[PDB]
Design a protein around this ligand. Structure first.
Ligand code: A1ITJ
Ligand code: A1ITJ
Ligand code: CL
Lengths: 305, 306
């Protein structure tokens, strides 16, 4: 038993991280097959960053302006091009450690593991969710750009995030691996702000089920509610709407625990209205919203990769 | 910016995990060079587990009674020995993925990454602390024995924990990689219970420093305390004593933030008395005690957001 914020094992991704240097800038790249992916802002000076014309900046660069190192081994760049906000550096060697992989664009509420890297060297791993406002609450310092987020299924790595910048409130923004930003952000040093965030309701419900599975039951009650009535409550507390699809996805946990989703919604309503009265749930005094239903089932059933 | 429970990248350890089978029992082992390390309880059946005589159980085994599988490949066992509560199986292949490594026994309050594994395959990675009562609060199911805990400061893997069992209260117990249990526990299914746990004071202070580094000062106050008066108060909330060693090791964080250690102690006293009044610190409504001073320096900026 026990329930922890758990990341995927990162080894398959570690073997893909490289150092990319362009002029005075060093950041991280992802080496898959014979391409290295990194943020296109790698080509910008501080002045350029204020209002970049990426096409024009890139025309002045040769392949030899991009220095790529995989550990202690230099990779030779043989082509360069952009896709959206990602730079693709074609190299002369396919990564022998390329895992089975896909590029996947995730939706708000979905979780993933982040491999924080500096100077092409993996430094740490942690779990994140894509927030409703399309930021992530990561942990990143100067030099972390090009760090990636991913999930694993069996042997297949699904890459979903590449890190581009930190916003003024200290949360993080980035792209999918095709260079499309999550959220209304641009790769320019200009005033930008996260929208007001909301809580991921389906994930809070999943975590309440995790708590029950782990023996924490004090918040259960005799009551139930309807989807419509509960959604009035969610709106009041800045929670995301709960959909029928969310209810459906939680069906296994409902069956396992004997607590219907709308019964657990009655528990959640009471927590929102009354607080925890000095108690905790799975060691938290807050309602945790960065475990998905799948995360709960995975961790409670010992799935491996 | 940000502050997360941050594990070490697990790849160097993933390449060392194997499955060990003896009779009907299968669990995880750690393959380093030409040795596989695993809990000695692998040689017990359910009928043996209450009062095992490990010497007597082991003498009845041959090398070929141990099956070791590394992915799809069977390794051949060519020797075995018991060291404390760990079994060491000598195999006829050195692991080509052996990282630079060492074995370290840690003290209560120290943190490490756990790679939870089943059938020699990794499931996930998370951070744990060695609690004052010599347990860890992990996430482990049936089949997780022989999963390990480690740090990877500076490219070398320091292995510090091997998982042996879950105790009745749902917390976890295990050994160092020399097979010595943390705490008073034994590898027998007899009644044993962890002592009452306490909060790791030095770690809470480190985390308050992290909060200041990351730009928040709301919980500070104008007061100070002596070390002795701090300890007299904090013990009333089931906090561990703060020693002069702890004060010394908080020195770098104190210097970076301009907040004397005993002034941060006065802040903590007031938080214990008042609670948060609806605020949070680094995304938590409780005082977090599973980040060490070293962990904070590892993860936070060297420049305070003033
Ligand atoms: C030389 C020109 N490049 C830059 O200026 C880089 C420098 C590196 N950075 C980091 O390494 C870092 C990452 N995570 C967290 C922290 Cl604290 C720092 C920050 C990102 N900026 C670009 C930038 C900055 C603000 C905004 Br708004 C948008 C953009 C464009 C997407
Ligand atoms: C067949 C004989 N071996 C056993 O019974 C094994 C079964 C495997 N186990 C697990 O895989 C597991 C690990 N973590 C968490 C969970 Cl929930 C289970 C639990 C450990 N026990 C031994 C045991 C059990 C209680 C105590 Br007290 C001491 C000891 C001796 C160290
Ligand atoms: Cl009702």
């Amino acid at each position: 038993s026990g329930f922890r914020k758990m990341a995927f094992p990162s080894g398959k991704v570690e073997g893909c991280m490289v150092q990319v240097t362009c002029g005075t800038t060093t950041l991280n790249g992802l080496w898959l097959d014979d391409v290295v992916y990194c943020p296109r802002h790698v080509i910008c000076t501080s002045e350029d960053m204020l209002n970049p014309n990426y096409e024009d900046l890139l025309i002045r660069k040769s392949n030899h302006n991009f220095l790529v190192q995989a550990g202690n081994v230099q990779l030779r760049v043989i082509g360069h091009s952009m896709q959206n906000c990602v730079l693709k550096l074609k190299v002369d060697t396919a990564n022998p450690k390329t895992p089975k992989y896909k590029f996947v664009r995730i939706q708000p509420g979905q979780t993933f593991s982040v491999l924080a890297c500096y100077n092409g060297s993996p430094s740490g791993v942690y779990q994140c969710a894509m927030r409703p406002n399309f930021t992530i609450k990561g942990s990143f310092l100067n030099g972390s750009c090009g760090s990636v987020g991913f999930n694993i299924d069996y042997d297949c790595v699904s890459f979903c995030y590449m890190h581009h910048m930190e916003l003024p409130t200290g949360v993080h923004a980035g792209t999918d691996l095709e260079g499309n930003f999550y959220g209304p952000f641009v790769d320019r040093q200009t005033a930008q702000a996260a929208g007001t965030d909301t809580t991921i309701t389906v994930n809070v419900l999943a975590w309440l089920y995790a708590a029950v599975i782990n023996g924490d039951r004090w918040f259960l009650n005799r009551f139930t509610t309807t989807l419509n009535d509960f959604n009035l409550v969610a709106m009041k507390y800045n929670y995301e709407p709960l959909t029928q699809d969310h209810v459906d996805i939680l069906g296994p946990l409902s069956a396992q625990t004997g607590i219907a989703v709308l019964d657990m919604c009655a528990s959640l309503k009471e927590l929102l209205q009354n607080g925890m009265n000095g108690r905790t749930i799975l060691g938290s005094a807050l309602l945790e919203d960065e475990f998905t239903p799948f995360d709960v089932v995975r961790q409670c059933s010992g799935v491996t990769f």
